[PDB]
Design an enzyme around this catalytic site. Structure first.
Site, PDB file in Angstrom:
ATOM      1  N   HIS A 185       0.840  -1.210   0.000  1.00 44.81           N
ATOM      2  CA  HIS A 185       0.000   0.000   0.000  1.00 44.81           C
ATOM      3  C   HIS A 185       0.883   1.273   0.000  1.00 44.81           C
ATOM      4  O   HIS A 185       0.748   2.119   0.874  1.00 44.81           O
ATOM      5  CB  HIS A 185      -0.997  -0.028   1.183  1.00 44.81           C
ATOM      6  CG  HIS A 185      -2.083  -1.075   1.040  1.00 44.81           C
ATOM      7  ND1 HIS A 185      -2.072  -2.256   1.742  1.00 44.81           N
ATOM      8  CD2 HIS A 185      -3.171  -1.136   0.234  1.00 44.81           C
ATOM      9  CE1 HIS A 185      -3.120  -2.987   1.403  1.00 44.81           C
ATOM     10  NE2 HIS A 185      -3.809  -2.330   0.492  1.00 44.81           N
ATOM     11  N   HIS A 191       1.084   1.191  -5.911  1.00 40.64           N
ATOM     12  CA  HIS A 191      -0.282   0.692  -5.873  1.00 40.64           C
ATOM     13  C   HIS A 191      -1.309   1.736  -6.249  1.00 40.64           C
ATOM     14  O   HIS A 191      -2.167   1.475  -7.107  1.00 40.64           O
ATOM     15  CB  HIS A 191      -0.630   0.097  -4.475  1.00 40.64           C
ATOM     16  CG  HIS A 191      -2.074  -0.258  -4.329  1.00 40.64           C
ATOM     17  ND1 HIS A 191      -2.684  -1.233  -5.095  1.00 40.64           N
ATOM     18  CD2 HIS A 191      -3.024   0.211  -3.481  1.00 40.64           C
ATOM     19  CE1 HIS A 191      -3.962  -1.314  -4.755  1.00 40.64           C
ATOM     20  NE2 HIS A 191      -4.198  -0.458  -3.770  1.00 40.64           N
ATOM     21  N   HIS A 212      -6.817   6.799  -2.809  1.00 38.75           N
ATOM     22  CA  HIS A 212      -7.697   5.891  -2.102  1.00 38.75           C
ATOM     23  C   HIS A 212      -7.023   5.126  -0.993  1.00 38.75           C
ATOM     24  O   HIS A 212      -7.706   4.602  -0.162  1.00 38.75           O
ATOM     25  CB  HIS A 212      -8.385   4.901  -3.058  1.00 38.75           C
ATOM     26  CG  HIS A 212      -7.556   3.700  -3.367  1.00 38.75           C
ATOM     27  ND1 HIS A 212      -6.563   3.714  -4.309  1.00 38.75           N
ATOM     28  CD2 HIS A 212      -7.598   2.444  -2.884  1.00 38.75           C
ATOM     29  CE1 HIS A 212      -5.979   2.530  -4.346  1.00 38.75           C
ATOM     30  NE2 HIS A 212      -6.598   1.741  -3.496  1.00 38.75           N
ATOM     31  N   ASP A 243      -8.970  -1.577  -7.876  1.00 41.64           N
ATOM     32  CA  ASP A 243      -8.250  -1.914  -6.620  1.00 41.64           C
ATOM     33  C   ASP A 243      -7.981  -3.412  -6.573  1.00 41.64           C
ATOM     34  O   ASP A 243      -6.923  -3.834  -6.107  1.00 41.64           O
ATOM     35  CB  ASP A 243      -9.124  -1.505  -5.460  1.00 41.64           C
ATOM     36  CG  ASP A 243      -8.400  -1.338  -4.152  1.00 41.64           C
ATOM     37  OD1 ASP A 243      -7.180  -1.119  -4.084  1.00 41.64           O
ATOM     38  OD2 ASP A 243      -9.148  -1.361  -3.128  1.00 41.64           O
ATOM     39  N   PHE A 290      -8.368 -16.263  -2.883  1.00 41.11           N
ATOM     40  CA  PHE A 290      -8.784 -14.879  -3.152  1.00 41.11           C
ATOM     41  C   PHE A 290      -9.462 -14.728  -4.494  1.00 41.11           C
ATOM     42  O   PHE A 290     -10.471 -14.053  -4.602  1.00 41.11           O
ATOM     43  CB  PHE A 290      -7.602 -13.903  -3.056  1.00 41.11           C
ATOM     44  CG  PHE A 290      -8.032 -12.452  -2.939  1.00 41.11           C
ATOM     45  CD1 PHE A 290      -8.909 -12.054  -1.928  1.00 41.11           C
ATOM     46  CD2 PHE A 290      -7.550 -11.479  -3.828  1.00 41.11           C
ATOM     47  CE1 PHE A 290      -9.314 -10.701  -1.813  1.00 41.11           C
ATOM     48  CE2 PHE A 290      -7.950 -10.141  -3.716  1.00 41.11           C
ATOM     49  CZ  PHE A 290      -8.835  -9.760  -2.704  1.00 41.11           C
TER      50      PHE A 290
HETATM   51  C1  LIG Z   1      -2.068  -9.653  -5.049  1.00 42.53           C
HETATM   52  C2  LIG Z   1      -3.577  -9.701  -5.296  1.00 42.53           C
HETATM   53  N1  LIG Z   1      -4.294  -8.949  -4.263  1.00 42.53           N
HETATM   54  N2  LIG Z   1      -4.656  -7.649  -4.373  1.00 42.53           N
HETATM   55  C3  LIG Z   1      -5.304  -7.323  -3.231  1.00 42.53           C
HETATM   56  C4  LIG Z   1      -5.391  -8.479  -2.351  1.00 42.53           C
HETATM   57  C5  LIG Z   1      -5.915  -8.782  -1.105  1.00 42.53           C
HETATM   58  N3  LIG Z   1      -6.581  -7.902  -0.273  1.00 42.53           N
HETATM   59  C6  LIG Z   1      -6.859  -6.495  -0.509  1.00 42.53           C
HETATM   60  C7  LIG Z   1      -6.819  -5.812   0.856  1.00 42.53           C
HETATM   61  C8  LIG Z   1      -7.159  -4.326   0.735  1.00 42.53           C
HETATM   62  O1  LIG Z   1      -8.382  -4.123   0.015  1.00 42.53           O
HETATM   63  C9  LIG Z   1      -8.560  -4.778  -1.228  1.00 42.53           C
HETATM   64  C10 LIG Z   1      -8.206  -6.268  -1.125  1.00 42.53           C
HETATM   65  C11 LIG Z   1      -5.708 -10.110  -0.661  1.00 42.53           C
HETATM   66  C12 LIG Z   1      -6.308 -10.652   0.569  1.00 42.53           C
HETATM   67  N4  LIG Z   1      -7.016  -9.906   1.435  1.00 42.53           N
HETATM   68  C13 LIG Z   1      -7.505 -10.839   2.468  1.00 42.53           C
HETATM   69  C14 LIG Z   1      -8.325 -10.437   3.670  1.00 42.53           C
HETATM   70  C15 LIG Z   1      -9.070  -9.107   3.410  1.00 42.53           C
HETATM   71  O2  LIG Z   1     -10.059  -9.059   2.691  1.00 42.53           O
HETATM   72  N5  LIG Z   1      -8.558  -8.011   4.041  1.00 42.53           N
HETATM   73  C16 LIG Z   1      -7.370  -8.006   4.913  1.00 42.53           C
HETATM   74  C17 LIG Z   1      -7.176  -6.527   5.301  1.00 42.53           C
HETATM   75  C18 LIG Z   1      -7.991  -5.747   4.266  1.00 42.53           C
HETATM   76  C19 LIG Z   1      -9.154  -6.678   3.885  1.00 42.53           C
HETATM   77  C20 LIG Z   1      -7.070 -12.044   2.083  1.00 42.53           C
HETATM   78  C21 LIG Z   1      -7.245 -13.399   2.701  1.00 42.53           C
HETATM   79  C22 LIG Z   1      -8.275 -14.222   1.954  1.00 42.53           C
HETATM   80  C23 LIG Z   1      -9.648 -14.047   2.171  1.00 42.53           C
HETATM   81  C24 LIG Z   1     -10.590 -14.816   1.481  1.00 42.53           C
HETATM   82  C25 LIG Z   1     -10.174 -15.777   0.559  1.00 42.53           C
HETATM   83  C26 LIG Z   1      -8.814 -15.959   0.334  1.00 42.53           C
HETATM   84  C27 LIG Z   1      -7.873 -15.188   1.018  1.00 42.53           C
HETATM   85  O3  LIG Z   1      -6.368 -11.962   0.931  1.00 42.53           O
HETATM   86  C28 LIG Z   1      -5.050 -11.028  -1.482  1.00 42.53           C
HETATM   87  N6  LIG Z   1      -4.537 -10.726  -2.668  1.00 42.53           N
HETATM   88  C29 LIG Z   1      -4.706  -9.456  -3.105  1.00 42.53           C
HETATM   89 MG   LIG Z   2      -7.680   0.537   0.847  1.00 41.87          MG
HETATM   90 ZN   LIG Z   3      -5.979  -0.130  -2.636  1.00 46.12          ZN
END
Ligand SMILES: CCn1ncc2c(NC3CCOCC3)c(-c3nc(CC(=O)N4CCCC4)c(Cc4ccccc4)o3)cnc21
Ligand SMILES: [Mg+2]
Ligand SMILES: [Zn+2]
Ligand SMILES: [As]
Ligand SMILES: [As]
Ligand SMILES: [As]
EC number: 3.1.4.53
Length: 336
Positions: free
Chosen positions: A83, A87, A123, A241, A295
């Site tokens: 972040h 990004h 953002h 995003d 994911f």
């Molecule tokens: C590299 C590909 N990518 N891009 C974003 C992202 C990602 N989370 C982003 C977090 C901020 O807002 C947009 C999405 C995750 C990711 N986020 C979570 C949890 C989540 O959603 N959060 C955590 C903090 C912010 C929100 C996971 C874990 C997960 C959940 C469900 C199914 C598989 C894996 O993976 C994985 N690859 C990403």
């Molecule tokens: Mg954000």
């Molecule tokens: Zn973002």
């Protein structure tokens, strides 16, 4: 027209070369950063606004624009793995591409196009590299300010809008009062929609709109009221995003490595504090490859499949790239 931010004469050429792909999904933002002395967000935003004649349309001084953008970029933490300003640059450039999809041709006003790209730029500004839930559970200053509700997203907006308060940085000085008022409402809406806790509900409503869509004769979506337009805009910025898995595998893999560095670092801080380790943030147990398969299956594919439906057939190549990339990470899981 600024053409470099560094001392390297070879970079002016390499940057202009990379920027020939400005309007393309396949632009490589990592190269843009390498050839701009680490100013991907300033330079891409400058390139986007000139490409769309937004500085002219909205009477924004090139000088003020660069100063605002440099300063916004400076409020992204370069020590945060994912972040950071690269990004934000990527999401703004991805949003610039999505705004030109043929299905939405002529749908959006200039003010709306402006809102959307600015929303993408701001953002994640001043993101500290930990999740809303970590901020809430640690009783952080941000969670106390924002009452546990869309803590980071409210912060990103506050920082972005607070930076316009100095005359030297007020890029929106020559909009009218009503224009500024409408852009603010639109940007707030779009950035708050990037909170993942809102995704399930945003998708439901998007599906529900795909169901009742009205592709006019000439092939363009009819989106007749503000309500429909801002709903597509909030979903577009959200898709952007969540676009990393839809890009070439070479780019996706570097994005994955950054988000897992960041996530694992949160995991470590949690351990340091005797907190419960969030499982996907645990470097000693979590599988990068499964997390991406998971994911995509649970979040990215359902969203983009639904976006594709909406913009048919504009997004078909994205969908296939995603499915290829998904298949690629699965095949890296040693078991079934
Ligand atoms: C590299 C590909 N990518 N891009 C974003 C992202 C990602 N989370 C982003 C977090 C901020 O807002 C947009 C999405 C995750 C990711 N986020 C979570 C949890 C989540 O959603 N959060 C955590 C903090 C912010 C929100 C996971 C874990 C997960 C959940 C469900 C199914 C598989 C894996 O993976 C994985 N690859 C990403
Ligand atoms: Mg954000
Ligand atoms: Zn973002
Ligand atoms: As530039
Ligand atoms: As300023
Ligand atoms: As986590």
């Amino acid at each position: 027209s600024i053409s470099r931010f560094g001392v390297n004469t070879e970079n002016e050429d390499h940057l202009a070369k990379e920027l020939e792909d400005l309007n393309k999904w396949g632009l490589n933002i990592f190269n843009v950063a390498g050839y701009s002395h680490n100013r991907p967000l300033t330079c891409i935003m400058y390139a986007i606004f000139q490409e769309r004649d937004l500085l002219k349309t909205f009477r924004i001084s090139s000088d003020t624009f660069i100063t605002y953008m440099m300063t916004l970029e400076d409020h992204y933490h370069s020590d945060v793995a994912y972040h950071n300003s690269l990004h934000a640059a990527d999401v703004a450039q991805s949003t610039h591409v999505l705004l030109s999809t043929p299905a939405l041709d002529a749908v959006f006003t200039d003010l709306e196009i402006l809102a959307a790209i600015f929303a993408a730029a701001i953002h994640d500004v001043d993101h500290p590299g930990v999740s809303n839930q970590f901020l809430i559970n640690t009783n952080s200053e941000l969670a106390l300010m924002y009452n546990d509700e869309s803590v980071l997203e409210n912060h990103h907006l506050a920082v972005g809008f607070k930076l316009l308060q100095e005359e030297h940085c007020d890029i929106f000085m020559n909009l009218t009062k009503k224009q500024r008022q409408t852009l603010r409402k639109m940007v707030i809406d779009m950035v708050l929609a990037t909170d993942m806790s809102k995704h399930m509900s945003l998708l439901a409503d998007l599906k529900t709109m795909v169901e009742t869509k009205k592709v006019t004769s000439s092939g363009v979506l009819l989106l007749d009221n503000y309500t429909d337009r801002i709903q597509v805009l909030r979903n577009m910025v959200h898709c952007a995003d969540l676009s990393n898995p839809t890009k070439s595998l070479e780019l996706y893999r570097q994005w994955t490595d950054r988000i897992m560095e960041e996530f694992f670092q949160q995991g470590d801080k949690e351990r340091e504090r005797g907190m419960e380790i969030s499982p996907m943030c645990d470097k000693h147990t979590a599988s990068v490859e499964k997390s991406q398969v998971g994911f995509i299956d649970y979040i990215v594919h359902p969203l983009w499949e639904t976006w594709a439906d909406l913009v048919q057939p504009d997004a078909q190549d994205i969908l296939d790239t995603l499915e290829d990339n998904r298949n690629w990470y699965q095949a890296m899981i040693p078991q079934a």
